[PDB]
């Protein structure tokens, strides 16, 4: 599970509201504290305001509707840190929410490249129509052309030992 938040904040010195600007940042994280942490990280690297001179005025959660659980196609732009350097790339996913899309990327890179979730950075999330799809993976499922049978058996009962003449699986 992963959530989406938008954080707002200003600069202060020995006195208040020293600049009339307000800064904003949308972030995918698990909770508000991990959200606030990211806001501090970006401010210090793109500007030079350290925490002691900042104040957060607001944090809000962003939520969709999707009462019917309709399935949508999304494209995601990302980078991650390896032992060598920083690696950029783009991949496409299907799901019922932007957060559902984002949790699947994080799982993928951990599986394929052996990276902990805190070393992955999301740059952009975009919802796409059928003509926009670039890579091969999801297109068959998007064009609604897939059926398959079950490969995994399923247990009939919670009992550990059963009679030879009973039905065992599904």
């Amino acid at each position: 599970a992963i959530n989406e938040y938008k954080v707002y904040g200003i600069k202060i010195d020995d006195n208040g509201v020293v600049g009339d600007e307000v800064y904003a940042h949308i972030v995918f994280a698990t909770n508000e504290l991990l959200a606030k942490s990211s806001f501090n990280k970006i401010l210090k690297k793109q500007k030079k305001i350290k925490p002691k001179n900042t104040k957060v005025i607001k944090v809000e959660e962003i939520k969709e509707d999707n009462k019917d659980l309709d399935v949508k196609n999304y494209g995601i732009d990302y980078y991650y840190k390896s032992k060598r350097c920083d690696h950029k790339g783009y991949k496409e996913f299907r799901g019922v929410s932007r957060c559902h899309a984002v949790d699947k990327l994080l799982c993928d890179i951990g599986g394929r490249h052996s990276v902990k979730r805190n070393l992955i950075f999301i740059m952009k999330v975009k919802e796409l129509t059928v003509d926009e799809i670039k890579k091969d993976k999801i297109k068959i499922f998007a064009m609604e052309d897939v059926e398959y049978p079950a490969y995994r058996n399923v247990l009939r009962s919670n009992k550990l030992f059963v009679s030879e003449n009973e039905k065992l699986f599904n």
């Binding site: 208040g16 980078y79 920083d86 740059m123």
Partner: protein, 156 residues
């Protein structure tokens, strides 16, 4: 192995700064000193009489006695896990007036007014203490002029 002369290990200490060689300036000689002032030691390598031992360089103490061209200053030091007072003789070319009491003296000047009024009108002074910086203040913000931030820099 090392040696134990009076000026051991003073190659960095006891050397003049870049473009600051030569004898002291007139202000050094025209400064008047009094018993009870706080004073600060900084050795001038060009003057060879009245030099203190290099342990005392950069330390601050209190004037105990005043002579023609030298001063006696009181210091404290730890030896064999006990505190010992030490009385150091220094020539006036190797000392400067210390700034360490500056703020306290200003505060005393304010207290000296209040403590008189406190006998006439009140009974006890308000005494004007310092306080450490408190929590972050409250703010009311107009909310036009929003600036967005993003991980646009890819950092190849």
């Amino acid at each position: 192995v090392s040696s134990h002369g009076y000026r051991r290990q003073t190659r960095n200490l006891f050397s003049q700064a870049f473009r600051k060689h030569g004898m002291p300036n007139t202000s050094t000689y025209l400064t008047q000193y009094a018993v009870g002032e706080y004073v600060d030691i900084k050795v001038n390598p060009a003057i060879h009489k009245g030099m203190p031992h290099k342990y005392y360089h950069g330390r601050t103490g209190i004037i105990k006695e005043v002579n023609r061209g030298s001063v006696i200053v009181l210091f404290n030091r730890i030896l064999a896990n006990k505190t010992v007072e030490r009385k150091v003789i220094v020539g006036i070319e190797h000392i400067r007036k210390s700034k360490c009491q500056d703020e306290y003296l200003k505060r005393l000047e304010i207290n000296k007014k209040i403590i008189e009024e406190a006998e006439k009108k009140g009974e006890v002074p308000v005494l004007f203490k310092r306080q450490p910086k408190g929590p972050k203040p409250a703010v009311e913000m107009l909310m036009n002029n929003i600036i967005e931030l993003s991980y646009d820099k890819v950092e190849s």
